[PDB]
Design a protein around this ligand. Structure first.
Ligand SMILES: Oc1cccc(O)c1
Ligand SMILES: Oc1cccc(O)c1
Ligand SMILES: Oc1cccc(O)c1
Ligand SMILES: Oc1cccc(O)c1
Ligand SMILES: Oc1cccc(O)c1
Ligand SMILES: Oc1cccc(O)c1
Ligand SMILES: [Cl-]
Ligand SMILES: [Cl-]
Ligand SMILES: [Zn+2]
Ligand SMILES: [Zn+2]
Lengths: 28, 17, 28, 17, 17, 28, 28, 29, 17, 29, 17, 17
Protein backbone atom coordinates (compact mmCIF):
# COMPACT_ATOMS: atom_id res chain seq x y z
CA UNK A 1 0.00 0.00 0.00
CA UNK A 2 3.09 2.26 0.10
CA UNK A 3 2.45 3.77 -3.36
CA UNK A 4 -1.24 4.48 -2.70
CA UNK A 5 -0.13 6.08 0.60
CA UNK A 6 2.34 8.41 -1.15
CA UNK A 7 -0.21 9.32 -3.89
CA UNK A 8 -2.87 10.24 -1.28
CA UNK A 9 -0.52 12.77 0.33
CA UNK A 10 -0.23 14.39 -3.10
CA UNK A 11 -4.00 14.07 -3.68
CA UNK A 12 -5.06 15.87 -0.45
CA UNK A 13 -2.66 18.77 -1.36
CA UNK A 14 -4.35 19.10 -4.84
CA UNK A 15 -7.80 18.97 -3.24
CA UNK A 16 -6.83 21.64 -0.79
CA UNK A 17 -5.86 23.83 -3.71
CA UNK A 18 -8.75 22.95 -6.04
CA UNK A 19 -11.41 23.27 -3.39
CA UNK A 20 -10.34 26.64 -1.95
CA UNK A 21 -12.84 27.85 0.68
CA UNK A 22 -15.40 25.09 0.16
CA UNK A 23 -12.94 22.60 1.65
CA UNK A 24 -13.32 18.92 0.95
CA UNK A 25 -14.24 15.46 2.18
CA UNK A 26 -11.41 12.96 1.85
CA UNK A 27 -11.77 9.13 1.92
CA UNK A 28 -8.95 6.84 0.52
CA UNK B 1 -10.23 7.26 -8.55
CA UNK B 2 -7.13 9.27 -8.50
CA UNK B 3 -4.22 6.96 -7.66
CA UNK B 4 -4.86 4.39 -10.44
CA UNK B 5 -5.12 6.97 -13.19
CA UNK B 6 -4.36 10.72 -12.81
CA UNK B 7 -7.32 13.03 -12.15
CA UNK B 8 -7.78 16.41 -13.79
CA UNK B 9 -8.87 19.60 -11.98
CA UNK B 10 -12.38 18.66 -13.04
CA UNK B 11 -12.31 15.12 -11.57
CA UNK B 12 -10.76 16.58 -8.40
CA UNK B 13 -13.78 19.03 -8.13
CA UNK B 14 -15.89 16.08 -7.05
CA UNK B 15 -14.17 15.71 -3.65
CA UNK B 16 -14.97 19.36 -2.74
CA UNK B 17 -17.69 20.15 -0.19
CA UNK C 1 -0.93 34.98 3.63
CA UNK C 2 -0.08 32.40 6.38
CA UNK C 3 -3.71 31.22 6.46
CA UNK C 4 -3.49 29.66 3.00
CA UNK C 5 -0.03 28.26 3.75
CA UNK C 6 -0.96 26.77 7.12
CA UNK C 7 -3.98 24.96 5.61
CA UNK C 8 -1.74 22.98 3.28
CA UNK C 9 0.29 21.64 6.23
CA UNK C 10 -2.88 20.95 8.23
CA UNK C 11 -4.41 18.75 5.48
CA UNK C 12 -1.20 16.71 5.22
CA UNK C 13 -1.22 16.16 8.97
CA UNK C 14 -4.87 15.15 8.89
CA UNK C 15 -4.15 12.75 6.03
CA UNK C 16 -1.45 11.12 8.12
CA UNK C 17 -3.36 11.15 11.40
CA UNK C 18 -6.68 9.87 9.99
CA UNK C 19 -5.38 7.07 7.78
CA UNK C 20 -7.95 4.89 6.13
CA UNK C 21 -10.79 6.79 7.85
CA UNK C 22 -10.10 9.95 5.81
CA UNK C 23 -11.14 13.36 7.12
CA UNK C 24 -13.40 16.30 6.42
CA UNK C 25 -11.72 19.67 5.93
CA UNK C 26 -13.02 23.26 5.77
CA UNK C 27 -11.48 26.64 6.43
CA UNK C 28 -13.48 28.89 8.83
CA UNK D 1 -7.11 26.62 16.19
CA UNK D 2 -4.17 24.76 14.53
CA UNK D 3 -2.47 27.44 12.38
CA UNK D 4 -1.70 29.60 15.37
CA UNK D 5 -0.51 26.71 17.55
CA UNK D 6 0.65 23.13 17.18
CA UNK D 7 -2.39 20.90 17.74
CA UNK D 8 -1.78 17.52 19.36
CA UNK D 9 -2.24 14.47 17.16
CA UNK D 10 -4.89 13.71 19.77
CA UNK D 11 -6.66 16.98 18.88
CA UNK D 12 -6.31 16.64 15.09
CA UNK D 13 -8.13 13.32 15.41
CA UNK D 14 -11.26 15.48 15.70
CA UNK D 15 -11.15 16.20 11.96
CA UNK D 16 -11.14 12.45 11.06
CA UNK D 17 -14.26 10.77 9.63
CA UNK E 1 2.41 38.86 -6.87
CA UNK E 2 1.51 35.86 -4.90
CA UNK E 3 3.23 36.09 -1.52
CA UNK E 4 1.88 39.55 -0.56
CA UNK E 5 -1.72 38.70 -1.33
CA UNK E 6 -3.05 35.21 -2.23
CA UNK E 7 -3.42 34.39 -5.93
CA UNK E 8 -6.37 32.54 -7.41
CA UNK E 9 -6.13 29.74 -10.00
CA UNK E 10 -6.61 32.47 -12.58
CA UNK E 11 -3.74 34.68 -11.36
CA UNK E 12 -1.55 31.55 -11.13
CA UNK E 13 -2.34 30.81 -14.87
CA UNK E 14 -0.03 33.67 -15.77
CA UNK E 15 3.15 31.84 -14.69
CA UNK E 16 2.37 28.90 -17.03
CA UNK E 17 4.36 28.44 -20.26
CA UNK F 1 13.10 36.74 3.70
CA UNK F 2 12.13 33.52 5.54
CA UNK F 3 8.37 33.99 4.98
CA UNK F 4 8.72 34.77 1.27
CA UNK F 5 10.95 31.67 1.02
CA UNK F 6 8.31 29.42 2.62
CA UNK F 7 5.50 30.91 0.46
CA UNK F 8 7.49 30.30 -2.77
CA UNK F 9 7.77 26.58 -1.97
CA UNK F 10 3.98 26.54 -1.75
CA UNK F 11 3.67 28.69 -4.89
CA UNK F 12 5.79 26.41 -7.15
CA UNK F 13 3.65 23.40 -6.00
CA UNK F 14 0.42 25.27 -7.03
CA UNK F 15 1.97 26.26 -10.36
CA UNK F 16 2.97 22.70 -11.00
CA UNK F 17 -0.63 21.69 -10.49
CA UNK F 18 -2.28 24.61 -12.30
CA UNK F 19 0.00 24.46 -15.30
CA UNK F 20 -0.21 20.70 -15.96
CA UNK F 21 1.67 19.77 -19.16
CA UNK F 22 2.46 23.32 -20.25
CA UNK F 23 4.85 23.64 -17.31
CA UNK F 24 5.85 27.04 -16.05
CA UNK F 25 8.50 29.73 -15.70
CA UNK F 26 9.25 30.62 -12.09
CA UNK F 27 11.01 33.82 -10.89
CA UNK F 28 10.71 34.98 -7.18
CA UNK G 1 0.96 7.61 -11.87
CA UNK G 2 4.55 8.20 -10.56
CA UNK G 3 5.20 10.72 -13.36
CA UNK G 4 2.79 13.26 -11.91
CA UNK G 5 4.02 12.56 -8.38
CA UNK G 6 7.71 12.81 -9.22
CA UNK G 7 7.21 16.20 -10.93
CA UNK G 8 5.94 17.74 -7.71
CA UNK G 9 9.15 16.74 -5.88
CA UNK G 10 11.30 17.89 -8.80
CA UNK G 11 9.83 21.43 -8.79
CA UNK G 12 10.44 21.76 -5.04
CA UNK G 13 14.05 20.70 -5.52
CA UNK G 14 14.49 23.15 -8.37
CA UNK G 15 12.97 25.91 -6.25
CA UNK G 16 15.51 25.18 -3.54
CA UNK G 17 18.47 24.69 -5.86
CA UNK G 18 17.83 27.74 -8.07
CA UNK G 19 17.06 30.30 -5.37
CA UNK G 20 16.59 33.85 -6.51
CA UNK G 21 17.34 32.88 -10.14
CA UNK G 22 14.10 30.86 -10.42
CA UNK G 23 13.80 28.06 -12.96
CA UNK G 24 11.92 26.97 -16.04
CA UNK G 25 9.96 23.73 -15.81
CA UNK G 26 8.26 21.48 -18.39
CA UNK G 27 7.34 17.82 -18.49
CA UNK G 28 8.53 15.94 -21.62
CA UNK H 1 8.08 -0.42 -7.58
CA UNK H 2 8.62 2.29 -4.96
CA UNK H 3 10.98 5.23 -5.57
CA UNK H 4 12.92 5.12 -2.30
CA UNK H 5 14.31 8.63 -2.74
CA UNK H 6 10.81 10.08 -3.07
CA UNK H 7 9.34 7.83 -0.42
CA UNK H 8 12.13 8.99 1.91
CA UNK H 9 10.94 12.65 1.59
CA UNK H 10 7.46 11.66 2.77
CA UNK H 11 8.83 9.56 5.58
CA UNK H 12 10.87 12.50 6.88
CA UNK H 13 7.77 14.70 6.83
CA UNK H 14 5.87 11.98 8.78
CA UNK H 15 8.72 11.68 11.27
CA UNK H 16 8.77 15.46 11.76
CA UNK H 17 5.04 15.37 12.61
CA UNK H 18 5.36 12.34 14.88
CA UNK H 19 8.53 13.22 16.76
CA UNK H 20 8.08 16.99 17.03
CA UNK H 21 10.87 18.81 18.90
CA UNK H 22 12.87 15.70 19.92
CA UNK H 23 13.47 14.71 16.33
CA UNK H 24 14.36 11.34 14.81
CA UNK H 25 17.54 9.25 14.72
CA UNK H 26 16.91 7.20 11.56
CA UNK H 27 14.85 7.38 8.38
CA UNK H 28 13.41 3.79 7.95
CA UNK H 29 13.13 3.47 4.14
CA UNK I 1 10.85 -1.24 6.01
CA UNK I 2 8.60 1.71 5.46
CA UNK I 3 9.25 2.32 1.77
CA UNK I 4 8.47 -1.30 1.00
CA UNK I 5 5.72 -2.02 3.60
CA UNK I 6 3.46 0.80 4.83
CA UNK I 7 4.28 1.98 8.37
CA UNK I 8 1.60 3.52 10.61
CA UNK I 9 2.37 6.70 12.67
CA UNK I 10 2.49 4.52 15.84
CA UNK I 11 5.16 2.49 14.08
CA UNK I 12 7.15 5.62 13.15
CA UNK I 13 7.16 6.67 16.81
CA UNK I 14 9.87 3.98 17.28
CA UNK I 15 12.35 6.14 15.34
CA UNK I 16 11.98 9.31 17.44
CA UNK I 17 14.80 10.33 19.78
CA UNK J 1 6.33 36.56 12.48
CA UNK J 2 7.48 33.09 11.41
CA UNK J 3 5.60 29.95 12.45
CA UNK J 4 8.55 27.87 13.65
CA UNK J 5 6.59 24.61 13.56
CA UNK J 6 5.71 25.12 9.90
CA UNK J 7 9.11 26.51 9.00
CA UNK J 8 10.64 23.41 10.62
CA UNK J 9 8.76 21.13 8.14
CA UNK J 10 10.31 22.98 5.21
CA UNK J 11 13.74 22.93 6.77
CA UNK J 12 13.57 19.15 7.19
CA UNK J 13 12.61 18.77 3.53
CA UNK J 14 15.60 21.01 2.56
CA UNK J 15 17.91 18.98 4.80
CA UNK J 16 16.69 15.73 3.23
CA UNK J 17 17.55 17.10 -0.23
CA UNK J 18 20.92 18.49 0.86
CA UNK J 19 22.17 15.63 3.02
CA UNK J 20 20.75 12.68 1.05
CA UNK J 21 21.58 9.25 2.48
CA UNK J 22 23.83 10.45 5.34
CA UNK J 23 21.03 12.43 6.93
CA UNK J 24 21.14 15.35 9.36
CA UNK J 25 21.92 15.67 13.07
CA UNK J 26 20.00 18.85 13.90
CA UNK J 27 17.11 20.90 12.54
CA UNK J 28 18.32 24.59 12.78
CA UNK J 29 15.05 26.50 13.34
CA UNK K 1 16.03 11.99 -16.32
CA UNK K 2 15.30 12.85 -12.63
CA UNK K 3 12.16 10.83 -11.79
CA UNK K 4 13.88 7.55 -12.51
CA UNK K 5 17.10 8.47 -10.67
CA UNK K 6 18.32 10.97 -8.11
CA UNK K 7 19.86 13.88 -10.05
CA UNK K 8 22.79 15.67 -8.44
CA UNK K 9 22.16 19.20 -7.22
CA UNK K 10 24.89 19.93 -9.76
CA UNK K 11 22.68 18.44 -12.52
CA UNK K 12 19.42 20.09 -11.38
CA UNK K 13 21.20 23.43 -11.74
CA UNK K 14 20.57 22.95 -15.46
CA UNK K 15 16.89 23.83 -14.98
CA UNK K 16 17.74 27.20 -13.30
CA UNK K 17 17.24 30.50 -15.17
CA UNK L 1 18.85 30.53 12.85
CA UNK L 2 17.09 29.38 9.75
CA UNK L 3 13.50 30.09 10.75
CA UNK L 4 14.41 33.64 11.64
CA UNK L 5 17.12 34.39 9.00
CA UNK L 6 17.02 32.63 5.61
CA UNK L 7 19.67 29.90 5.23
CA UNK L 8 21.04 28.93 1.80
CA UNK L 9 21.48 25.22 0.85
CA UNK L 10 25.28 25.64 1.26
CA UNK L 11 24.55 26.80 4.79
CA UNK L 12 22.30 23.79 5.49
CA UNK L 13 25.12 21.47 4.42
CA UNK L 14 26.68 22.24 7.85
CA UNK L 15 23.94 20.19 9.55
CA UNK L 16 24.44 16.96 7.57
CA UNK L 17 26.04 13.97 9.27
O1 LIG M 1 -4.64 11.63 -9.40
C1 LIG M 1 -3.92 12.57 -8.72
C2 LIG M 1 -3.21 12.17 -7.60
C3 LIG M 1 -2.47 13.09 -6.90
C4 LIG M 1 -2.42 14.41 -7.31
C5 LIG M 1 -3.14 14.83 -8.42
O2 LIG M 1 -3.08 16.15 -8.82
C6 LIG M 1 -3.90 13.89 -9.13
O1 LIG N 1 -1.87 21.92 14.47
C1 LIG N 1 -1.12 21.54 13.39
C2 LIG N 1 -1.12 22.31 12.25
C3 LIG N 1 -0.40 21.97 11.11
C4 LIG N 1 0.37 20.87 11.11
C5 LIG N 1 0.38 20.13 12.27
O2 LIG N 1 1.11 19.04 12.28
C6 LIG N 1 -0.36 20.40 13.44
O1 LIG O 1 -0.38 33.23 -3.45
C1 LIG O 1 -0.20 31.89 -3.31
C2 LIG O 1 0.97 31.44 -2.72
C3 LIG O 1 1.18 30.10 -2.54
C4 LIG O 1 0.23 29.19 -2.96
C5 LIG O 1 -0.94 29.61 -3.57
O2 LIG O 1 -1.88 28.68 -3.98
C6 LIG O 1 -1.15 30.98 -3.75
O1 LIG P 1 3.93 8.00 6.52
C1 LIG P 1 4.70 7.22 5.75
C2 LIG P 1 5.46 7.78 4.72
C3 LIG P 1 6.22 6.98 3.89
C4 LIG P 1 6.25 5.59 4.09
C5 LIG P 1 5.47 5.01 5.10
O2 LIG P 1 5.47 3.66 5.25
C6 LIG P 1 4.69 5.82 5.92
O1 LIG Q 1 16.46 14.15 -9.41
C1 LIG Q 1 15.65 14.55 -8.38
C2 LIG Q 1 14.28 14.39 -8.49
C3 LIG Q 1 13.40 14.81 -7.51
C4 LIG Q 1 13.87 15.35 -6.37
C5 LIG Q 1 15.24 15.48 -6.27
O2 LIG Q 1 15.71 16.03 -5.18
C6 LIG Q 1 16.18 15.11 -7.25
O1 LIG R 1 15.36 25.96 2.83
C1 LIG R 1 14.99 26.56 3.98
C2 LIG R 1 13.81 26.19 4.62
C3 LIG R 1 13.41 26.83 5.77
C4 LIG R 1 14.19 27.85 6.33
C5 LIG R 1 15.37 28.26 5.67
O2 LIG R 1 16.10 29.28 6.19
C6 LIG R 1 15.77 27.62 4.50
CL1 LIG S 1 4.61 27.56 5.57
CL1 LIG T 1 5.88 10.35 -4.26
ZN1 LIG U 1 4.68 25.80 4.42
ZN1 LIG V 1 5.62 12.19 -3.28
Amino acid sequence: FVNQHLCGSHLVEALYLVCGERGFFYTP
Amino acid sequence: QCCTSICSLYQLENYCN
